[PDB]
């Protein structure tokens, strides 16, 4: 089996997995919608009671499986629990990352396309009226991905966007095809440093922004000022947990796959802890100190929150660059912003494609080259669904990147810390660890975490089961139909892999 060359390379590879579009895009929005400081309390709690224990659990399961030549859940679940149903459940460890990757890579191609156009200097040129400053960039984004005037189902992506998406796919392949140590590890040792330093630079510059309407400092205050009146709102907790799962790449089966390349005897405790800690630093300190504080600076808190509630891409692809355009060298600043997003997204996109590749290599015994090329083909082909179908991206993000990851996180924990045995799991987690997990986390993993996730899922289902059936748009049923097709497709490959073994 292939392994990580150095401990450092391992750490930065995992950090590149977590730290991504979720930090500079999803987080600012989630925190803004949930009342800044009021969102932070549940967020931290969710990080302690959910993020860390699951992180360690996934690392353990990964290395455990990897030692026997299996990096994906279909096999690993079976190793932890003997049952056909264990394999069927493990199919999500492939379905989830694949579905998410389909649209994730596309968003990543956006940041790239933007990074290019902003570098060359081809951008809209605003003239004191907020709308007259934002409108040009709204039209700019809409022209790029091809957004309809009214609410129309079909998207018309510009040739440039499509070509950029091809390039993005190429870059992803060029990295993945070189292997774990030579391809992913090498890139991580470069991208991450660049990323952190670009992020750092952007946080400085942004913090310097101050206008008659507000300051970046007002934004930092808003984000870090505690509010206890929102603690009784379940929605805040649900959003916090969802963000923790997404940002830490938990429930995507990515962490597990990466961990399967860690040598049986190498530490996963301190490594895992360090990776997660880096992500949070990149999330709360970097991610939350760029977008929000800038919006608040120019438009004020109220408007900033309104803009955040407007959409997820509205703050990242429209508001921020529009704000930069009003400053000296704002065009170049916008470039660094999209270059940062691109490197963050690229480091994550490769991570959610690897689980599929690892399955083909491990279970179907395909060469790395073939495994990568076929994975890219599937993603690229499926991407047309997200590219040309409005609301398809949202549907995938929801079913896979929201519900799926939580459901899968609960499943893997139940299989590992319950069926497989709590003590055995604990012993497996701490084995070889440079430091040992606090004893208390034993009771967190076995009782607290699973219960909280279960309650969450129950609450969700109660609200969603009626809404699903009554949804007017056909694009979602097409998306649903197709991803269900993808699931069946993957189950069939597992069947073949199972048959080859015999
Ligand atoms: C799906 C995951 C790879 C997402 C990543 N953890 C992020 O924060 O963007
Ligand atoms: Na990343
Ligand atoms: Na992240």
- Dig out the tokens for 342 from the structure: 């691109």
279 lines ligand 1 (CB under 6 A): no
Alpha carbon of 108 to ligand 3 centroid (Å): 14
Ligand 1 atom having least distance to the Cα of 100? 1
- Dig out the tokens for 315 from the structure: 């703050």
* Whether the Cβ atoms of residue 162 and residue 156 lie closer than 8 Å to each other: no
* Whether the Cβ atoms of residue 94 and residue 356 lie closer than 8 Å to each other: yes
Three-state SS sequence of 240-276: HHHHHHHHCCCCCCHHHHHHCCCCCCCCCHHHHHHHH
Ligand nearest to the CA of 249: 1
Q: Which of 17, 20, 51, 355 to mutate to test the pocket of ligand 1 (most atoms within 8 A of CB)?
A: 20
Look at residues 318, 332, 255 and name the one whose alpha carbon lies nearest to residue 29: 318
| Residues written for the chain | 502
Bridge partner list, 154: 389
d(CA 198, CA 448): 38
Look at residues 51, 8, 59, 3 and name the one whose alpha carbon lies nearest to residue 269: 59
Chain breaks after residues in the chain, where C lies over 2.5 Å from next N: 127
* Whether the Cβ atoms of residue 331 and residue 325 lie closer than 8 Å to each other: yes
Neighbours of 201 (CB within 10 A): 13
Residue 439 phi/psi, 5-degree rounding, is -50, -35
- Dig out the tokens for 370 from the structure: 């073939």
354 lines ligand 1 (CB under 6 A): no
> Which residue in this structure is represented by tokens 């549940």?
42
252 lines ligand 1 (CB under 6 A): yes
Ligand 1 atom having least distance to the Cα of 279? 8
d(CA 344, CA 198): 11
Ligand nearest to the CA of 16: 2
Ligand nearest to the CA of 26: 1
Q: Domain span at residue 130?
A: 1-502
Method: X-ray
Residue 121 phi/psi, 5-degree rounding, is 95, 20
**Strand, helix or coil for residue 433:** coil
Residue 439 annotated as binding site: no
Alpha carbon of 105 to ligand 3 centroid (Å): 15
* Whether the Cβ atoms of residue 19 and residue 340 lie closer than 8 Å to each other: no
> How many CA atoms does the CB half-sphere of 433 hold within 13 Å?
19
254 lines ligand 1 (CB under 6 A): yes
* Whether the Cβ atoms of residue 415 and residue 77 lie closer than 8 Å to each other: yes
Alpha carbon of 75 to ligand 1 centroid (Å): 24
Q: What is the DSSP letter of 289?
A: G
Helix axes 92-120, 130-145, angle to 10 degrees: 120
The experimental resolution of this structure, in angstroms, equals 3.5
Residue nearest to atom 3 of ligand 1 (CA): 348
**Strand, helix or coil for residue 154:** strand
23 lines ligand 1 (CB under 6 A): yes
Q: Which helix (H) or strand (E) holds 357?
A: helix 330-362
Look at residues 267, 273, 272 and name the one whose alpha carbon lies nearest to residue 431: 267
To 5 degrees, how large is the angle CA 335–CA 143–CA 294? Answer: 40
351 lines ligand 1 (CB under 6 A): yes
* Whether the Cβ atoms of residue 444 and residue 89 lie closer than 8 Å to each other: no
Number of structural domains found in the chain: 1
* Whether the Cβ atoms of residue 176 and residue 183 lie closer than 8 Å to each other: yes
Look at residues 238, 311, 201, 300 and name the one whose alpha carbon lies nearest to residue 39: 238
Ligand nearest to the CA of 343: 2
Q: What is the DSSP letter of 210?
A: E
d(CA 340, CA 289): 14
Q: Which of 15, 21, 97 to mutate to test the pocket of ligand 1 (most atoms within 8 A of CB)?
A: 21
161 lines ligand 1 (CB under 6 A): no
- Cα separations (Å) of 360 from 260, 297, 324? 14, 50, 45
* Whether the Cβ atoms of residue 24 and residue 290 lie closer than 8 Å to each other: yes
100 lines ligand 1 (CB under 6 A): yes
* Whether the Cβ atoms of residue 309 and residue 236 lie closer than 8 Å to each other: no
Tell me the chain's radius of gyration from C-alpha atoms: 22
């Amino acid at each position: 089996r292939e392994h990580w060359a150095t401990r450092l390379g391992l750490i930065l590879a995992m950090a590149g997995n977590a730290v991504g579009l979720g930090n500079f895009l999803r987080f600012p929005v989630q925190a803004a919608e949930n009342g800044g400081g009021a969102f932070m309390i549940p967020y931290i709690i969710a990080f302690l009671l959910v993020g860390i224990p699951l992180m360690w659990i996934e690392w353990a399961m990964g290395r455990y499986g990897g030692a026997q030549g299996h990096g994906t859940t279909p096999a690993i679940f079976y190793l932890l629990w003997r049952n056909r149903f264990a394999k069927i459940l493990g199919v999500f460890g492939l379905w989830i990352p694949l579905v998410v990757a389909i649209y994730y890579v596309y968003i990543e191609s956006w940041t790239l396309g933007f990074a290019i156009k902003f570098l060359v200097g081809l951008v809209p040129e605003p003239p004191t009226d907020p709308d007259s400053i934002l409108r040009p960039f709204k039209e700019f984004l809409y022209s790029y991905i091809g957004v309809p005037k009214g609410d129309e189902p079909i998207l018309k992506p510009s040739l440039f966007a499509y070509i950029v998406f091809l390039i993005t796919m190429f870059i992803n392949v060029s990295i993945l095809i070189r292997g774990i140590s030579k391809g992913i590890e090498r890139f991580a040792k470069i991208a991450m440093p660049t990323l952190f330093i670009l992020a750092v630079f952007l946080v400085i510059r942004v913090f310097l922004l101050e206008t008659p309407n507000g300051t970046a400092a007002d934004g930092l205050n808003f984000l870090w000022t505690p509010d206890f009146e929102k603690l009784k709102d379940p929605g805040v907790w649900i959003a916090a947990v969802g963000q923790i799962f997404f940002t830490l790449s938990l429930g995507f089966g990515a962490i597990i796959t990466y961990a399967s390349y860690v040598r049986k005897d190498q530490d996963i405790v301190l490594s895992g802890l360090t990776a997660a800690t880096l992500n949070e630093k990149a999330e709360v300190i970097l991610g939350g100190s760029i977008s929000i504080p800038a919006a608040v600076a120019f438009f004020g808190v109220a408007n900033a929150v309104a803009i955040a509630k407007a959409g997820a891409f509205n703050l990242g692809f429209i508001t921020l660059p529009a704000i930069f355009s009003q400053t000296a060298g704002g065009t170049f600043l916008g470039f660094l912003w999209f270059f940062l997003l691109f490197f963050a997204g690229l480091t994550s996109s490769i991570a959610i494609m690897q689980p599929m590749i690892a399955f083909l290599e491990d279970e179907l015994k395909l060469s790395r080259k073939h495994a990568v090329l076929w994975t890219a083909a599937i993603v690229f082909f499926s991407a047309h669904l997200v590219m040309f179908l409005n609301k398809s991206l949202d549907e995938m993000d929801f079913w896979a990147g929201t519900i799926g990851v939580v459901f899968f996180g609960l499943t893997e924990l139940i299989i590992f810390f319950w069926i497989f045995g709590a003590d055995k799991a604990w012993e497996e987690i701490n084995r070889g660890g440079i430091i040992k997990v606090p004893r208390i986390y034993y009771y967190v993993m076995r009782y607290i975490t699973p219960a909280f996730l279960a309650v969450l899922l129950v609450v969700w289902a109660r609200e969603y089961i009626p809404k699903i059936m009554e949804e007017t748009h056909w694009t979602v049923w097409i998306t649903r139909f197709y991803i269900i097709g993808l699931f069946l497709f993957l189950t069939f490959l597992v069947f073949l892999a199972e048959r080859r073994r015999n």
